[PDB]
Every structure is written in C-alpha cells, then in structure tokens.
PDB file of C-alpha atoms and ligand atoms in Angstrom:
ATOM      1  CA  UNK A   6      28.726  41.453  69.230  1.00 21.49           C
ATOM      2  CA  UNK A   7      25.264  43.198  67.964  1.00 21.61           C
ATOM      3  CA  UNK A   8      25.020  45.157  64.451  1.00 23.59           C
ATOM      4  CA  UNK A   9      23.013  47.306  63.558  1.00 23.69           C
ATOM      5  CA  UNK A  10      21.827  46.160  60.395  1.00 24.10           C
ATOM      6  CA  UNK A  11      22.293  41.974  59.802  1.00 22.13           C
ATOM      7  CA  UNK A  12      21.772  39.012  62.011  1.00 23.99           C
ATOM      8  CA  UNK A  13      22.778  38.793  65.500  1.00 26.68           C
ATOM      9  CA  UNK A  14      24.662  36.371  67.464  1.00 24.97           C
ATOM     10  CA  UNK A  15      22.777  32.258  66.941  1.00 25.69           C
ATOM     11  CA  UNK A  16      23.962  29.464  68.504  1.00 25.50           C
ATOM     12  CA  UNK A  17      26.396  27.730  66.546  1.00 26.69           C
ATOM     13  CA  UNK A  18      27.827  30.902  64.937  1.00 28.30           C
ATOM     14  CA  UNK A  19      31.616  30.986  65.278  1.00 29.60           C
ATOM     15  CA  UNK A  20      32.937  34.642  66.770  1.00 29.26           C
ATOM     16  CA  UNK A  21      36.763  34.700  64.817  1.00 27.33           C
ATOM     17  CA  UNK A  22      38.918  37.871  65.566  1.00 24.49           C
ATOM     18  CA  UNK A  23      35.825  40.386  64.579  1.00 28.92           C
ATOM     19  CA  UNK A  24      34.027  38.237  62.134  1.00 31.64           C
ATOM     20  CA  UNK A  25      31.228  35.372  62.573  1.00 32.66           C
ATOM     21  CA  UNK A  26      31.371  32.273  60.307  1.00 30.59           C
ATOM     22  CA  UNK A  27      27.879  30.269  60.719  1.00 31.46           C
ATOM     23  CA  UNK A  28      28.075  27.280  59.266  1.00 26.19           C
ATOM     24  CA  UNK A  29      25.033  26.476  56.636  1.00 19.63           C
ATOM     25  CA  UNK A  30      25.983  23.234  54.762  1.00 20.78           C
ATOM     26  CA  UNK A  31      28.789  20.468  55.393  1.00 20.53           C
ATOM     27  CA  UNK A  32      30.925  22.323  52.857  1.00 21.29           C
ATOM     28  CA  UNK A  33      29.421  25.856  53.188  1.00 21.42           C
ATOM     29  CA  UNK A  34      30.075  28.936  55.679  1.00 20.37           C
ATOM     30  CA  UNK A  35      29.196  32.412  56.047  1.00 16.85           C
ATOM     31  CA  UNK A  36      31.329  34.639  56.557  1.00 15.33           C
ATOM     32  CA  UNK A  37      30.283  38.009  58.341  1.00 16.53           C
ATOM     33  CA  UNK A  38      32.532  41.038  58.622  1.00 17.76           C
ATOM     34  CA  UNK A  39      31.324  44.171  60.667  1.00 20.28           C
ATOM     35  CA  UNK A  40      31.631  48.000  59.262  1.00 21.14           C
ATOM     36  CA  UNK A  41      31.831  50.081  62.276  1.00 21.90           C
ATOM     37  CA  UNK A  42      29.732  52.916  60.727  1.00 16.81           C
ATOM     38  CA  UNK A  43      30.703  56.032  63.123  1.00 16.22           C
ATOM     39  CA  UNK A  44      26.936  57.143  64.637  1.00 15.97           C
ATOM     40  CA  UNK A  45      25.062  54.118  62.833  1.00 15.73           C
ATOM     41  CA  UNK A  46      26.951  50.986  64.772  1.00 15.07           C
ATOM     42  CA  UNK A  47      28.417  47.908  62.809  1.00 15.46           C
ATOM     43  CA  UNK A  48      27.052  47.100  59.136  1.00 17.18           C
ATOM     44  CA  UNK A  49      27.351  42.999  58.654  1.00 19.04           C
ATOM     45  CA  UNK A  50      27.861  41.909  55.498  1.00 21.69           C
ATOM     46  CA  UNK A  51      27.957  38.279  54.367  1.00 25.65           C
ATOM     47  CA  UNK A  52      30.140  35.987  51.898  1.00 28.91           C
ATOM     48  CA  UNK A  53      30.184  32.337  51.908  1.00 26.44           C
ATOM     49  CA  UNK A  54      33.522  30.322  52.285  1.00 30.18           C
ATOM     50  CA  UNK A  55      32.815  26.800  50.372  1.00 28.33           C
ATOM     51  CA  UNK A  56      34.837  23.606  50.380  1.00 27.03           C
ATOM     52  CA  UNK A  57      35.370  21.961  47.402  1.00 24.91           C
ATOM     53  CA  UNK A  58      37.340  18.702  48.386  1.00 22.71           C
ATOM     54  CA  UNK A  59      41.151  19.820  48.788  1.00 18.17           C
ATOM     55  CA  UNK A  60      40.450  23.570  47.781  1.00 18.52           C
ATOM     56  CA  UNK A  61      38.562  26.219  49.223  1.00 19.73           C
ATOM     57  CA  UNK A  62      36.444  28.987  47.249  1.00 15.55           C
ATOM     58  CA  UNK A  63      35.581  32.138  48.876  1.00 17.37           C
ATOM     59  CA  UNK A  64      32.324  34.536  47.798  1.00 15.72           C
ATOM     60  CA  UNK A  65      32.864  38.254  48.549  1.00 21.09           C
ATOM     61  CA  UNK A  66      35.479  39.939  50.310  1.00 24.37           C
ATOM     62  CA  UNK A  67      35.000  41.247  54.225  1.00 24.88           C
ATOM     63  CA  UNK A  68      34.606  45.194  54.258  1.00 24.88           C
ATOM     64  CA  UNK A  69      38.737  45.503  54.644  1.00 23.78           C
ATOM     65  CA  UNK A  70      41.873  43.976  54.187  1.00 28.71           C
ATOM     66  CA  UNK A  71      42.557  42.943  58.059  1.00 28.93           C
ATOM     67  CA  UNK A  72      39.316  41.363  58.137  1.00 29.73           C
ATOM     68  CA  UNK A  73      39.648  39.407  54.483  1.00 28.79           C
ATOM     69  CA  UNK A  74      42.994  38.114  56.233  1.00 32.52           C
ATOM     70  CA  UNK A  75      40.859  36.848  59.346  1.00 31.03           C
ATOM     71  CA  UNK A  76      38.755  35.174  56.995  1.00 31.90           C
ATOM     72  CA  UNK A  77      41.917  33.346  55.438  1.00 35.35           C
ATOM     73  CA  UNK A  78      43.084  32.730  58.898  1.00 36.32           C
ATOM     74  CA  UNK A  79      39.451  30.932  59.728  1.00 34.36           C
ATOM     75  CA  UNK A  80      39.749  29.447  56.868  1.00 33.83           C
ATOM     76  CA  UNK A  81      43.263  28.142  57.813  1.00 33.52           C
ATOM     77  CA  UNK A  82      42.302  27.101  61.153  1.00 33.19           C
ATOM     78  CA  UNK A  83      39.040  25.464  60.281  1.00 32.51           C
ATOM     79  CA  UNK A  84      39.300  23.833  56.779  1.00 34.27           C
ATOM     80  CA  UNK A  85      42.971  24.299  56.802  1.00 33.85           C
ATOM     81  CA  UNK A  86      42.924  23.623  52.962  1.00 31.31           C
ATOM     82  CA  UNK A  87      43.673  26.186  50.474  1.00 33.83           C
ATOM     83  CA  UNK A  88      41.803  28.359  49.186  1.00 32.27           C
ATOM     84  CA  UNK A  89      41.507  28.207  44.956  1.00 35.37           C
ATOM     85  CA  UNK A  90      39.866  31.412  44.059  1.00 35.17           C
ATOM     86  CA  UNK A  91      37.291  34.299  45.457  1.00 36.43           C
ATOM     87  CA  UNK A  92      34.381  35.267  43.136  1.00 35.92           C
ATOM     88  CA  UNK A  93      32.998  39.264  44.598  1.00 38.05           C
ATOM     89  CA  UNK A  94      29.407  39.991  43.662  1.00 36.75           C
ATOM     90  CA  UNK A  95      29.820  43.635  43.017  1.00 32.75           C
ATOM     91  CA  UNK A  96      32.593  46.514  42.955  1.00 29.91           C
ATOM     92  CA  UNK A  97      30.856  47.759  46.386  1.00 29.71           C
ATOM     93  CA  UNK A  98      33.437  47.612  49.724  1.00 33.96           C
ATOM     94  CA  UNK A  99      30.920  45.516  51.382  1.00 35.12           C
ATOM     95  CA  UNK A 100      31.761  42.651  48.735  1.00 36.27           C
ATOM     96  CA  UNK A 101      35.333  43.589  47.199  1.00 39.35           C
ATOM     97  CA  UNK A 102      36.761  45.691  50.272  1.00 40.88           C
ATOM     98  CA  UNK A 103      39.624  42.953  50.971  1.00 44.94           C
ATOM     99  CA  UNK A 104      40.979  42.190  47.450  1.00 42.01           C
ATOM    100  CA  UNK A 105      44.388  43.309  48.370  1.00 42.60           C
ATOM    101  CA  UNK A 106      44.085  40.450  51.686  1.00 39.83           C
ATOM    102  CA  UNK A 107      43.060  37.700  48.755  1.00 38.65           C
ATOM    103  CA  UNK A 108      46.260  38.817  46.086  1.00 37.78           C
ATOM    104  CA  UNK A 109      48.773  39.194  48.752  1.00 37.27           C
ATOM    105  CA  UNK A 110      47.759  35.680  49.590  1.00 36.81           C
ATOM    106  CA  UNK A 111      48.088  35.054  46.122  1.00 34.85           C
ATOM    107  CA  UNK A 112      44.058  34.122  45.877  1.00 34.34           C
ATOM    108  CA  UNK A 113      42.833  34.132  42.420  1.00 36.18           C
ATOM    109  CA  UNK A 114      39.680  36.976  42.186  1.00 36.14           C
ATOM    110  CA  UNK A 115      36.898  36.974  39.565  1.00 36.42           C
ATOM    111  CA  UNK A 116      34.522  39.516  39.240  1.00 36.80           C
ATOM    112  CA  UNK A 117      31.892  40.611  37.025  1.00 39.85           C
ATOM    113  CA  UNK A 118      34.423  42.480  34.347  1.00 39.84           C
ATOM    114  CA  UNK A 119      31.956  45.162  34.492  1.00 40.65           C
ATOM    115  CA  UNK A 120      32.600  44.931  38.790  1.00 41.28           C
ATOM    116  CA  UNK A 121      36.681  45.042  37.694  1.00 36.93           C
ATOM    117  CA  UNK A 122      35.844  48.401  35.202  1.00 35.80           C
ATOM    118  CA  UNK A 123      33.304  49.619  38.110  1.00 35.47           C
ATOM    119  CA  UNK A 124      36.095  48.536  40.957  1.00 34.22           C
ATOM    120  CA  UNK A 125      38.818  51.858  40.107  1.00 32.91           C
ATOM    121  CA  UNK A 126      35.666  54.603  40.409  1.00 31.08           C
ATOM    122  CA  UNK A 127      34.328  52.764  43.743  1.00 29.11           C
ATOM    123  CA  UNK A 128      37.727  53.272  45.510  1.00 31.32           C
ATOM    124  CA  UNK A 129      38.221  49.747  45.126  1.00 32.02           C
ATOM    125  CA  UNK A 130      40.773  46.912  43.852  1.00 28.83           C
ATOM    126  CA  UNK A 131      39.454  45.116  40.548  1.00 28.22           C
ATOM    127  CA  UNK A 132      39.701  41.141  40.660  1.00 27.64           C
ATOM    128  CA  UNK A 133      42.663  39.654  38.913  1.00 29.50           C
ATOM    129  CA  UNK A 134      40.029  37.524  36.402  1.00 32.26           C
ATOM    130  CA  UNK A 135      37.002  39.385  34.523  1.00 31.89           C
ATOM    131  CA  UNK A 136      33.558  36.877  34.214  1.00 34.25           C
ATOM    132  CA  UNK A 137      31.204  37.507  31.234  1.00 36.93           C
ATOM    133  CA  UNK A 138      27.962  36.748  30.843  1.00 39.03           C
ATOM    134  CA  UNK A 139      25.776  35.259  28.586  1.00 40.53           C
ATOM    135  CA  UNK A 140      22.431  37.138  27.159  1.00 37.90           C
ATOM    136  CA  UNK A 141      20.633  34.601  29.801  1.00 38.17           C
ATOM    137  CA  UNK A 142      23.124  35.761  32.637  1.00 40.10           C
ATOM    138  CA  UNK A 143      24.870  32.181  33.090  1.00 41.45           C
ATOM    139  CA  UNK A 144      28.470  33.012  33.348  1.00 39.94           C
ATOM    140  CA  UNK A 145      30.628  32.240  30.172  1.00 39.03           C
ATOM    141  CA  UNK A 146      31.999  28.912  31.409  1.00 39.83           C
ATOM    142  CA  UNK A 147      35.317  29.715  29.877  1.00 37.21           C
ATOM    143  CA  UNK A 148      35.666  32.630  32.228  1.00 39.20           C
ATOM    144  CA  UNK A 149      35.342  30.963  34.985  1.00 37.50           C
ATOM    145  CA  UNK A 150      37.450  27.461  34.897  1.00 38.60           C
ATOM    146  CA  UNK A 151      37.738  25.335  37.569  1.00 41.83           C
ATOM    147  CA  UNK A 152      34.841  27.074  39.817  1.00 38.63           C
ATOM    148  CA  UNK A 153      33.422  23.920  40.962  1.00 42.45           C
ATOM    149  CA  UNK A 154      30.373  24.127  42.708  1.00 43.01           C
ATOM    150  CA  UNK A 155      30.528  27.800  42.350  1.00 42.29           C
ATOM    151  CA  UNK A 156      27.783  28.704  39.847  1.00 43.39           C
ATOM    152  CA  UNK A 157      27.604  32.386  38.864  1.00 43.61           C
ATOM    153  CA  UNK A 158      24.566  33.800  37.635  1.00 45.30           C
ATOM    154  CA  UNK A 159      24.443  37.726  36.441  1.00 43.03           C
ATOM    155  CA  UNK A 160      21.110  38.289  37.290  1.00 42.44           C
ATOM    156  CA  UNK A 161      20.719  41.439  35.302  1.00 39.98           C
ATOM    157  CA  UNK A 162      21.018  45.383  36.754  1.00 39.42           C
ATOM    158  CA  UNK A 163      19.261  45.493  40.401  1.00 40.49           C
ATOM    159  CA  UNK A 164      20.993  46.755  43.511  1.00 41.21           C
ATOM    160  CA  UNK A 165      23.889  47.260  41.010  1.00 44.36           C
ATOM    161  CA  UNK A 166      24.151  47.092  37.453  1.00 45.75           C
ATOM    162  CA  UNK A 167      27.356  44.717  37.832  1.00 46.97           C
ATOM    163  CA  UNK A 168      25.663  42.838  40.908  1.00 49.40           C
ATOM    164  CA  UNK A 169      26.375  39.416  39.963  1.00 49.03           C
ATOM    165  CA  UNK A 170      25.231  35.633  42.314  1.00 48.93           C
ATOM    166  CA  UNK A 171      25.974  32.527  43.414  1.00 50.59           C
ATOM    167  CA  UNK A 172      24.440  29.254  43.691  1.00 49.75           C
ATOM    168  CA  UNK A 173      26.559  26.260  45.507  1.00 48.33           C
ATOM    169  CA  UNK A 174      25.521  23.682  43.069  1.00 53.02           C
ATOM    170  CA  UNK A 175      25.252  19.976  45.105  1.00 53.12           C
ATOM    171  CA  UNK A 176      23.846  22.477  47.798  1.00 53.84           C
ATOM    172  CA  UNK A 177      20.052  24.162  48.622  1.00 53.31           C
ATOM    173  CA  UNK A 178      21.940  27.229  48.782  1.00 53.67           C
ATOM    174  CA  UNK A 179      22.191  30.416  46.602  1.00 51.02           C
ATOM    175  CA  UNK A 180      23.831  33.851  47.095  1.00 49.92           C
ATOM    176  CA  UNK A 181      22.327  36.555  45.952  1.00 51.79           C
ATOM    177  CA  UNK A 182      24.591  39.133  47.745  1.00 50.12           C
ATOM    178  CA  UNK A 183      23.037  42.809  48.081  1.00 48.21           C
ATOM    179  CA  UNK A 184      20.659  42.087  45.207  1.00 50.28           C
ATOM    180  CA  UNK A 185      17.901  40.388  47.765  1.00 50.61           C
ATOM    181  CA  UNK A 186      16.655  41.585  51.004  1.00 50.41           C
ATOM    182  CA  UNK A 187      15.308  39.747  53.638  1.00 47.82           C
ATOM    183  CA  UNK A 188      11.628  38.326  53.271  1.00 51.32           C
ATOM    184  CA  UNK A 189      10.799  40.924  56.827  1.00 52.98           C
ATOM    185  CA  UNK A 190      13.237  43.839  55.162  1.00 50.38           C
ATOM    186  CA  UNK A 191      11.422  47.301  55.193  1.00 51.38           C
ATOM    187  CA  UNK A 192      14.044  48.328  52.653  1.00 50.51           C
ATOM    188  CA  UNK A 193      16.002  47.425  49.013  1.00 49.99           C
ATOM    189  CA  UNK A 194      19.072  48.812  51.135  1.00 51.61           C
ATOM    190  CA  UNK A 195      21.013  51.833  48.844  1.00 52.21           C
ATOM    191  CA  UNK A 196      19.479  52.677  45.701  1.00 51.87           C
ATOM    192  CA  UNK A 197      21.933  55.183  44.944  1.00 48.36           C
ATOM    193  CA  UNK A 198      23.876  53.266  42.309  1.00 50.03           C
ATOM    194  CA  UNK A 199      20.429  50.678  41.529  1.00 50.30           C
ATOM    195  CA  UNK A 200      18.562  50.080  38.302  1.00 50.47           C
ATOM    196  CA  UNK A 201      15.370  50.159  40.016  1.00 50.43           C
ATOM    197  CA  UNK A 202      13.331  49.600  36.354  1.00 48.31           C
ATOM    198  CA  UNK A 203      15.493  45.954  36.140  1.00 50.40           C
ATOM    199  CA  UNK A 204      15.562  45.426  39.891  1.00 52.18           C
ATOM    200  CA  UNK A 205      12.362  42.721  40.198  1.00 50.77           C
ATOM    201  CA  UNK A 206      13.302  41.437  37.035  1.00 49.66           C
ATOM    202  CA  UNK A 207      16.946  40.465  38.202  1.00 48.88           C
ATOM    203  CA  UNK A 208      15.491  39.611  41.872  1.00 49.00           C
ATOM    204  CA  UNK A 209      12.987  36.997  40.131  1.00 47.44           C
ATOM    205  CA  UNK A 210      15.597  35.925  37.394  1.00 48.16           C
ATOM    206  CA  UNK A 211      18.090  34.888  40.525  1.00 44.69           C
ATOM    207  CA  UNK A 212      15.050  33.111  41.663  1.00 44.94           C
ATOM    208  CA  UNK A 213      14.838  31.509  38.340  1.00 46.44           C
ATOM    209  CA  UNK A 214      18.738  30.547  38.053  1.00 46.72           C
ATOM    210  CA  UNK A 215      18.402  28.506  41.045  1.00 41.43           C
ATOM    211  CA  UNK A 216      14.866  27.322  41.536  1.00 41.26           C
ATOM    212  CA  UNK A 217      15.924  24.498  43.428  1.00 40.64           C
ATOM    213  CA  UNK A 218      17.994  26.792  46.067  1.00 40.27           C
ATOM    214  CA  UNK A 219      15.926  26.699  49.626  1.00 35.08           C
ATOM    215  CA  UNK A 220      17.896  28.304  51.387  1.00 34.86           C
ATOM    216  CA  UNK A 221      19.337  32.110  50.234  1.00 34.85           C
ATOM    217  CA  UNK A 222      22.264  33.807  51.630  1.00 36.43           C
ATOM    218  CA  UNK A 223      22.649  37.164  50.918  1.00 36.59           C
ATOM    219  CA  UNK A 224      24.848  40.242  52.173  1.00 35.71           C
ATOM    220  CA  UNK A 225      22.949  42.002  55.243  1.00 38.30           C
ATOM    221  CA  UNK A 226      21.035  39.276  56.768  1.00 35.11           C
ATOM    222  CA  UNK A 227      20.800  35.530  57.850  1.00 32.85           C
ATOM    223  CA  UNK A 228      20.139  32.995  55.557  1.00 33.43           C
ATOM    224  CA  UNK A 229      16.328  32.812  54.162  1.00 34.46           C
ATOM    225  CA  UNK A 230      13.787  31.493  52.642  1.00 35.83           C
ATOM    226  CA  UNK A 231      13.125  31.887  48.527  1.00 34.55           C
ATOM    227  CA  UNK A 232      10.360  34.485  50.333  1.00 32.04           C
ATOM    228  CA  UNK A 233      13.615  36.766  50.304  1.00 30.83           C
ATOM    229  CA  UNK A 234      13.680  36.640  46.404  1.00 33.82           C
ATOM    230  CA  UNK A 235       9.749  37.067  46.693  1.00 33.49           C
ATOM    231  CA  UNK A 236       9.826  39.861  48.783  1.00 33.81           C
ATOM    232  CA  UNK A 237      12.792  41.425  47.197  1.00 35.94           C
ATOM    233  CA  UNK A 238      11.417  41.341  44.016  1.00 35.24           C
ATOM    234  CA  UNK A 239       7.778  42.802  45.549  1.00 34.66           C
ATOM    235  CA  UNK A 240       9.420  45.502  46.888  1.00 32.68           C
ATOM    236  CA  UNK A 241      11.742  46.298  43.508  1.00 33.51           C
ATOM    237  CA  UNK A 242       7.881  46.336  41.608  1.00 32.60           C
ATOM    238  CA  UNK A 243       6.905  49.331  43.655  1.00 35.73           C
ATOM    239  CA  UNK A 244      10.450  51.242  42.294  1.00 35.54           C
ATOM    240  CA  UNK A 245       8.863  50.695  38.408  1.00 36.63           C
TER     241      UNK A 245
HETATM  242  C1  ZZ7 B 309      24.363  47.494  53.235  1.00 36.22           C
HETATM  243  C2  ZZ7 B 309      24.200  48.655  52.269  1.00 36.22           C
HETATM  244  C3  ZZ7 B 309      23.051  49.547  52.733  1.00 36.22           C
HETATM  245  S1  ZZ7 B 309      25.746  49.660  52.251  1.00 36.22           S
HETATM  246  C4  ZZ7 B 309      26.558  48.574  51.047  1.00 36.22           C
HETATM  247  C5  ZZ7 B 309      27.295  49.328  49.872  1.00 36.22           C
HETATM  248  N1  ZZ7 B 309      28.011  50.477  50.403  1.00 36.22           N
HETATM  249  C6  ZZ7 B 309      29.285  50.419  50.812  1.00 36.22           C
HETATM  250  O1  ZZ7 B 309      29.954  49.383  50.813  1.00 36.22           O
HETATM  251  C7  ZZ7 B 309      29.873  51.751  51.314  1.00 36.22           C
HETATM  252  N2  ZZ7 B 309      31.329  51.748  51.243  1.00 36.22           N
HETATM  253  C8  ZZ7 B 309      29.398  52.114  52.712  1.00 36.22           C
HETATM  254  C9  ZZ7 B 309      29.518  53.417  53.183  1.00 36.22           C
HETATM  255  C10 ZZ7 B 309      29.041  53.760  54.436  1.00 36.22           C
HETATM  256  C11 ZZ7 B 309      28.444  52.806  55.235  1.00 36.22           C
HETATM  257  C12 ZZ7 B 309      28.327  51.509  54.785  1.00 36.22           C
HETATM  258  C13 ZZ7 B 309      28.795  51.165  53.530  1.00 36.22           C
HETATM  259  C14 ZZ7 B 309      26.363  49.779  48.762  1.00 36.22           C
HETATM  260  O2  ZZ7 B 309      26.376  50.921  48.365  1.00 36.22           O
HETATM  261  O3  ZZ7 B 309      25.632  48.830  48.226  1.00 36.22           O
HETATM  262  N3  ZZ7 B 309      25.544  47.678  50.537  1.00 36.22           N
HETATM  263  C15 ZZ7 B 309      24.206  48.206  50.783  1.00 36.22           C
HETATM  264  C16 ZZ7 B 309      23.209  47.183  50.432  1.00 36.22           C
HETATM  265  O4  ZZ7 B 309      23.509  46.002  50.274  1.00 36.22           O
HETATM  266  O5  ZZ7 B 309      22.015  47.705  50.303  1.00 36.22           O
HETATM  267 CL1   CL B 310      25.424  21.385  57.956  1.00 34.67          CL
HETATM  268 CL1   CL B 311      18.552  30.116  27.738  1.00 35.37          CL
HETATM  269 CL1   CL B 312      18.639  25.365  41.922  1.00 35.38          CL
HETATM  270 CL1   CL B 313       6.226  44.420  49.914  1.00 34.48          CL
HETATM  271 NA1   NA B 314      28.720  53.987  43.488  1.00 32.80          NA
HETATM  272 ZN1   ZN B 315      26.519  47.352  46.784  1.00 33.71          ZN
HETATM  273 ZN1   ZN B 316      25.509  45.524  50.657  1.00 35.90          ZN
END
C-alpha cells in the first residue's frame, strides 16, 4: 500500500486493482498508479479522471498499459460513463506509459505535438491528436475541440521542454503534472531532460494560467496548496 515517493494511503482514497483514485471535486479524481522501482519501492504518479456530464476526460496515463486499463475499469465501475478523450502532460512513462490501454479502448489522446515528436525517442506511444500552443502557452483552441472543462496551459520548458498542464475550469483545481513539486519537496524530481534556465518561469507562469486554482494536483504527491507552485518555482531559481 506505501510508496516510496507520493502520498500514502488517506481516508477516503479508493484502493482499485493496484491503483488509488482519491476523490478531489464532485466531478474530479486522482488517479494514482504505482512503478515498482526494483531496490527503490513503488513510484506514484498522479492523473486526474474528470466528469464532464455524460463523458469522461482522463489527464495522464498510469505508468503501463494493465494499469491505464484499471483506470478505465474504475472509471467503468464508478462513473460508468464514457470516457471522451485523455490529454498526457509529457512524453515521460509516468504520464503517457498506457497510451496503447486508451487506443485499444478507442480513447481519443492529445498531447503536446512536441510530447507526440518526443513520445518515439522516450520508448513511448505518441497521442493520436497533437495540441499547439500559443506564444502565451494557452492551447490553440482548435486543437483541442470539445475538451470541456479541460483547460491546457503549456507552461513553457521546466521539468520537460514539452511538459504541458491542466486546469479543471468550474473547479479550484489545476494540474501541473511533474512540472511542480510539493510545497515540503527537497527536490525538482529528474532534471535529466529539464530546462532548468525556464523552469521558475514555467512553474510561476502555471501559477499565472490559473490564479484562481487552490488546490494543485500534480504527478508525485497529494494535492496542494498554490505554495507548491511557490516552492517549485523557489527551488527552479536556485537551478539559474
Ligand atoms: C518521478 C520522477 C522522479 S521519474 C518520472 C519520469 N521518469 C520515468 O517515467 C522513467 N521511465 C522512470 C525510470 C525509472 C524509475 C522511475 C521512472 C521522468 O523522467 O520525469 N518523473 C520524475 C518527476 O516527475 O520528477
Ligand atoms: Cl468533493
Ligand atoms: Cl496574452
Ligand atoms: Cl484559475
Ligand atoms: Cl526553497
Ligand atoms: Na528523456
Ligand atoms: Zn517527466
Ligand atoms: Zn514524474
């Protein structure tokens, strides 16, 4: 039940084969999926699963296929409506490790096109549907039709230079995947592939897209407070 690096078991988290779903908002789960890292323990990473009346949209793949399905199943079981399209934050296999679950269930997958060009070198599966961005980072609205409260922000190079977010307009919530840390994290997680000149910048500019967002999800820990962007970004001023 206990990872090494993200949140442990709450109250009101929702064990599902080996994933936890906590809910965060009437319409709005996370969705954690566990990395058995041989000699480190389990890596959590976190999506969001968001109902948007009779269609469900799904933010970031689990770390496989098996467990992207046992999201779908949750999903199944517990909203039992269908799900419209997955948006994956980055070409990492924390965020896009399950595409092949999401096509074989026929789930239509944006990314960043720069995550789908990234996708082929990471291992990975690019999304069926490329997002652009605009010079301010909003995504080109034509790119991403019929994303409903989905709002995706490209927040500029950070943990990735792809790494794109997510706020749940009608919501207090906003994803900012691997890009933000915890407001206690010691760490930016792996730098290997980071643009750690841009990093604060695109930490405070995620900030900035969703100013209103209290409450920030992001990939290796439980929901915070905007102190995650605050921190996050404090920490990424140090790499300049
Ligand atoms: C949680 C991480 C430290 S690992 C993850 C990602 N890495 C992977 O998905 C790798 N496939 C991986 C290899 C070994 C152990 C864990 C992950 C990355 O490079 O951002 N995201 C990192 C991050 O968000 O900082
Ligand atoms: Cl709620
Ligand atoms: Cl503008
Ligand atoms: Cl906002
Ligand atoms: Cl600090
Ligand atoms: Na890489
Ligand atoms: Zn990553
Ligand atoms: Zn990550």
């Amino acid at each position: 039940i206990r990872p090494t690096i993200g949140q442990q078991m709450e109250t009101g988290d929702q064990r599902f084969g080996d994933l936890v779903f906590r809910q965060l908002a009437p319409n709005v789960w996370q969705h954690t999926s566990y990395l058995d890292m041989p000699g480190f323990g389990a890596v959590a990473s976190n999506g969001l699963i968001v109902r948007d009346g009779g269609r469900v949209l799904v933010v970031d793949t689990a770390w496989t296929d098996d467990q992207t399905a046992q999201i779908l199943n949750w999903i199944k079981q517990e909203i039992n409506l269908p799900v419209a399209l997955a948006v994956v934050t980055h070409a990492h296999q924390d965020k896009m490790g399950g595409m092949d679950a999401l096509h074989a269930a026929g789930i239509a997958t944006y990314a960043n096109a720069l995550s789908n060009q990234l996708a082929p070198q990471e291992g990975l599966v690019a999304a069926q549907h490329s997002l652009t961005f605009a010079a301010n980072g909003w995504v080109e609205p034509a790119t991403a039709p019929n994303f409903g409260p989905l709002k995706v922000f490209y927040p500029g190079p950070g943990h990735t230079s792809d790494n794109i977010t997510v706020g749940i307009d009608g919501t207090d919530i906003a994803f900012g995947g691997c890009l933000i840390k915890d407001s206690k994290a010691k760490s930016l997680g792996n730098l290997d592939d980071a643009d750690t000149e841009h990093y604060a910048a695109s930490a405070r500019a995620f900030g900035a897209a969703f100013p209103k967002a209290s409450m920030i999800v992001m990939s290796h820990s439980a929901p915070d407070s905007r102190a995650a962007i605050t921190h996050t970004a404090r920490m990424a001023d140090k790499l300049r």
